[PDB]
Structures are given as structure tokens and as C-alpha cells.
Design an enzyme around this catalytic site. Structure first.
Site, PDB file in Angstrom:
ATOM      1  N   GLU A 264      36.018 -20.257  47.790  1.00 26.68           N
ATOM      2  CA  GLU A 264      35.651 -20.118  45.949  1.00 26.68           C
ATOM      3  C   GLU A 264      34.975 -21.726  45.944  1.00 26.68           C
ATOM      4  O   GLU A 264      35.229 -22.283  45.079  1.00 26.68           O
ATOM      5  CB  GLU A 264      36.324 -19.816  45.227  1.00 26.68           C
ATOM      6  CG  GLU A 264      36.342 -17.848  45.382  1.00 26.68           C
ATOM      7  CD  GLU A 264      35.062 -17.742  44.771  1.00 26.68           C
ATOM      8  OE1 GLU A 264      34.832 -18.120  43.465  1.00 26.68           O
ATOM      9  OE2 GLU A 264      34.747 -16.798  45.490  1.00 26.68           O
TER      10      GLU A 264
ATOM     11  N   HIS B  32      37.929 -15.978  41.034  1.00 28.29           N
ATOM     12  CA  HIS B  32      37.522 -17.904  41.600  1.00 28.29           C
ATOM     13  C   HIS B  32      39.055 -18.798  41.936  1.00 28.29           C
ATOM     14  O   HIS B  32      39.330 -19.290  42.545  1.00 28.29           O
ATOM     15  CB  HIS B  32      37.013 -18.254  39.931  1.00 28.29           C
ATOM     16  CG  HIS B  32      36.412 -19.838  40.712  1.00 28.29           C
ATOM     17  ND1 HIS B  32      35.548 -19.700  41.615  1.00 28.29           N
ATOM     18  CD2 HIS B  32      36.295 -20.581  40.018  1.00 28.29           C
ATOM     19  CE1 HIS B  32      35.579 -20.554  41.863  1.00 28.29           C
ATOM     20  NE2 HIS B  32      35.651 -21.589  40.740  1.00 28.29           N
TER      21      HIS B  32
ATOM     22  N   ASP C 145      36.202 -25.160  44.786  1.00 22.51           N
ATOM     23  CA  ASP C 145      34.903 -24.925  43.144  1.00 22.51           C
ATOM     24  C   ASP C 145      34.853 -26.600  43.084  1.00 22.51           C
ATOM     25  O   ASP C 145      33.806 -27.197  43.857  1.00 22.51           O
ATOM     26  CB  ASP C 145      36.311 -25.190  42.241  1.00 22.51           C
ATOM     27  CG  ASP C 145      35.667 -24.959  40.931  1.00 22.51           C
ATOM     28  OD1 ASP C 145      34.480 -23.728  40.361  1.00 22.51           O
ATOM     29  OD2 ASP C 145      35.483 -26.039  40.243  1.00 22.51           O
ATOM     30  N   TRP C 146      34.433 -27.598  42.143  1.00 19.75           N
ATOM     31  CA  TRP C 146      34.275 -29.023  42.459  1.00 19.75           C
ATOM     32  C   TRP C 146      34.691 -30.024  44.113  1.00 19.75           C
ATOM     33  O   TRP C 146      34.165 -30.494  43.850  1.00 19.75           O
ATOM     34  CB  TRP C 146      34.231 -29.203  41.061  1.00 19.75           C
ATOM     35  CG  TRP C 146      33.077 -29.282  39.763  1.00 19.75           C
ATOM     36  CD1 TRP C 146      33.209 -28.370  39.257  1.00 19.75           C
ATOM     37  CD2 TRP C 146      31.675 -29.249  40.465  1.00 19.75           C
ATOM     38  NE1 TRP C 146      31.746 -27.767  38.411  1.00 19.75           N
ATOM     39  CE2 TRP C 146      30.007 -28.294  39.014  1.00 19.75           C
ATOM     40  CE3 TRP C 146      30.733 -29.928  41.135  1.00 19.75           C
ATOM     41  CZ2 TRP C 146      28.995 -28.352  38.933  1.00 19.75           C
ATOM     42  CZ3 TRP C 146      29.594 -29.992  40.965  1.00 19.75           C
ATOM     43  CH2 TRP C 146      28.858 -28.848  40.422  1.00 19.75           C
TER      44      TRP C 146
ATOM     45  N   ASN D 248      36.781 -27.240  38.302  1.00 21.23           N
ATOM     46  CA  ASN D 248      37.142 -27.508  37.228  1.00 21.23           C
ATOM     47  C   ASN D 248      37.914 -25.924  37.021  1.00 21.23           C
ATOM     48  O   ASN D 248      37.908 -25.365  37.606  1.00 21.23           O
ATOM     49  CB  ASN D 248      35.879 -27.167  36.239  1.00 21.23           C
ATOM     50  CG  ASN D 248      36.085 -27.561  35.430  1.00 21.23           C
ATOM     51  OD1 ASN D 248      36.847 -28.083  35.179  1.00 21.23           O
ATOM     52  ND2 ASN D 248      35.177 -26.839  34.702  1.00 21.23           N
TER      53      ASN D 248
HETATM   54 CL   LIG Z   1      32.151 -25.514  36.073  1.00 22.78          CL
END
Ligand SMILES: [Cl-]
Ligand SMILES: [Cl-]
Ligand SMILES: [Mg+2]
Ligand SMILES: [Mg+2]
Ligand SMILES: [Mg+2]
Length: 297
Positions: A131, A271, A107-108, A37
């Protein structure tokens, strides 16, 4: 290099009634790059060229993101983790990946990739991650300066902040990149989310899925499971650490450092570290794949 141009033209596959878009360049066993995301395949554009010649280079757009179709109906119950996994598992099967997949995740993309790996362990040749959501966390583990905003996404404030004001795209994304982006780079990230309302729902449903303080209990259980598996798995791993970083710091970073058969580098970034240090990231992934796939030229 740095640069705003995308890495190739996308293809798509029909999945459950919807077009899912993906980059697929080159030949050989897959090197599978998975964004989270509020990004898309575009996140990897400057990293993937480093792997030229080393495999089939694939980057999928998650459902409702990049150039993958929007789900309709959409609302608060749409685009949860389990639904993204149902679409992505189907796409990954459709891609005919075989059993020597190198995962490259963020991330996701990491929560989805780590869970897919736990469930298909013999098919995973290596895991490169950065990350990441490597375990369930507490609020104390979240980056301090973004804590209130993420609490707000998770509250009923989220719809105005995201569906109307597009704050994940317009504020969180550039706020977690050290360098200023060009308009072209911003346009590529804005593109899937130009329209107000439900088009933006994936960027709101995602922060509502992060396993923090035991909620939501379903994703917490999923992340507990992959964390437990990764901490004992002999699969080769490449940890791309970041300074200052954002999510994979403190407790989570210490946890990641316990994982077996792992090598590490540290790059500059917060990030979205792909935007700050893509050549260093790509160079490390290339070295990793070369070790895993000795060509003896
Ligand atoms: Cl998120
Ligand atoms: Cl819950
Ligand atoms: Mg269609
Ligand atoms: Mg579109
Ligand atoms: Mg911390």
C-alpha cells in the site's frame, strides 16, 4: 497475533534540536519498518514479532508523529516531504544501520524508504512494501470513494477538516481498516493528535504532498526518480499486495508487478492492511529475511 499492546518501549535520539522516538529491539542487521500517514511505529506492533531473532528490529516515528517532537513554528509550510526526509535521513544515520538494511514500508514510509534506497543502494539488502506510493499518479488512479475527501484535504478546506475536526485520524484511518478497532487501538493512533490545531498539521501536510496530476511538482519528481530506479533494480523485493487494497491497485499495482527479483503475496485489507492481516504479513516478511540471511541452523 492481533492485539493492542505495543511491541516495546520507545527510545529517542536528539535530531536537529528535536527528540525522535523509535522502537529498537534485538540484535543483528537492521529490519527497518517505516509507517506513513496518520500512523506511527504502533502500526507494526503485530508484524515485528514475526522477525524475532532475525535482526535488529527498528520502527521510527516520523517528525511530529507518534512520540517524536512537534516542530514549532508550524503552519501550511511545515511537515512537507523534504522536511520529513531531512529529519529521517539524520535519524537513520544516527542509528548506525550499516549496509545490509531490509526496508519494510507503507504509505509515506514507502515514498521515504524508496527514495532513501535509491540514494543508498549498496546499503539495502531487500525491500518489502505494501500500500505504497510507488509512482506519481492521476486522480483516475485514486480510490473512487475517497477521491472527493482527498481533493478537500488538498484545498483550503483542509485546515477545518484536519486541524479542527481531525478527520484523517477519525474517519480515513478506521474507514481503511476492514475490522473494527478497539478503543485502545484507536487511542494509540489518536495519542499524538489529541490537541486541536498545529499538533495535527502532519496529517494535513501529508495528503497535500501526494504526487497526483503533476502536483506538487517537487514530490512528483522524487517519485518519478524512485519509480524509474525500482523498475530496473536487482535488489530483492517482497510485494505484499492487498484485496481490495486502496492505493496499490489498478495502474500502480500493474507497474509494481513489473519490478524485477520480486515475490508476492496477497492479504485481506484496504489501506492500513497491518490491522487486518498482521500475522500473514509478518510471516511473509520473516520468510523473505530468512532467504536473505541464510543462518544454516
Ligand atoms: Cl496522505
Ligand atoms: Cl506544483
Ligand atoms: Mg528537547
Ligand atoms: Mg507526545
Ligand atoms: Mg482504481
Amino acid at each position: 497475533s492481533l492485539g493492542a499492546k505495543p511491541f516495546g518501549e520507545k527510545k529517542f535520539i536528539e535530531i536537529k534540536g528535536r527528540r525522535m522516538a523509535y522502537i529498537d529491539e534485538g540484535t543483528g542487521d537492521p529490519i527497518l519498518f517505516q509507517h506513513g500517514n496518520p500512523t506511527s511505529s504502533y502500526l507494526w506492533r503485530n508484524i515485528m514479532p514475526h522477525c524475532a531473532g532475525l535482526g535488529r528490529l527498528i520502527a521510527c516515528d516520523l517528525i511530529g508523529m507518534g512520540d517524536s517532537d512537534k516542530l514549532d513554528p508550524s503552519g501550511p509550510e511545515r511537515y512537507a516531504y523534504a522536511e520529513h526526509r531531512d529529519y529521517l535521513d539524520a535519524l537513520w544515520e544516527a542509528l548506525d544501520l550499516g549496509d545490509r538494511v531490509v526496508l519494510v514500508v507503507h504509505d509515506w514510509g514507502s515514498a521515504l524508504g524508496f527514495d532513501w534506497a535509491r540514494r543508498h543502494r549498496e546499503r539495502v539488502q531487500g525491500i518489502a512494501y505494501m500500500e505504497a506510493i510507488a509512482m506519481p499518479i492521476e486522480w483516475a488512479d485514486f480510490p473512487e470513494q475517497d477521491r472527493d475527501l482527498f481533493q478537500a484535504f488538498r484545498s483550503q478546506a483542509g485546515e477545518e477538516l484536519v486541524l479542527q475536526d481531525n478527520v484523517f485520524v477519525e474517519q480515513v484511518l478506521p474507514g481503511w481498516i476492514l475490522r473494527p478497532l478497539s478503543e485502545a487501538e484507536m487511542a494509540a493512533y489518536r495519542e499524538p493528535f489529541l490537541a486541536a490545531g498545529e499538533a495535527r498539521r502532519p496529517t494535513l501536510s501529508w495528503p497535500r504532498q501526494i504526487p497526483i496530476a503533476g502536483t506538487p511538482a517537487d514530490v512528483v519528481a522524487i517519485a518519478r526518480d524512485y519509480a524509474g530506479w525500482l523498475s530496473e533494480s536487482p535488489i530483492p523485493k517482497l510485494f505484499i499486495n492487498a484485496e481490495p487494497g486502496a492505493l496499490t491497485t489498478g495502474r500502480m499495482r500493474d507497474f509494481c508487478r513489473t519490478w524485477p527479483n520480486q515475490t508476492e503475496i496477497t492479504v485481506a485489507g484496504a489501506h492500513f492492511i497491518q490491522e487486518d492481516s498482521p500475522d500473514e504479513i509478518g510471516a511473509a516478511i520473516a520468510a523473505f529475511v530468512r532467504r536473505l540471511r541464510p543462518a544454516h541452523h
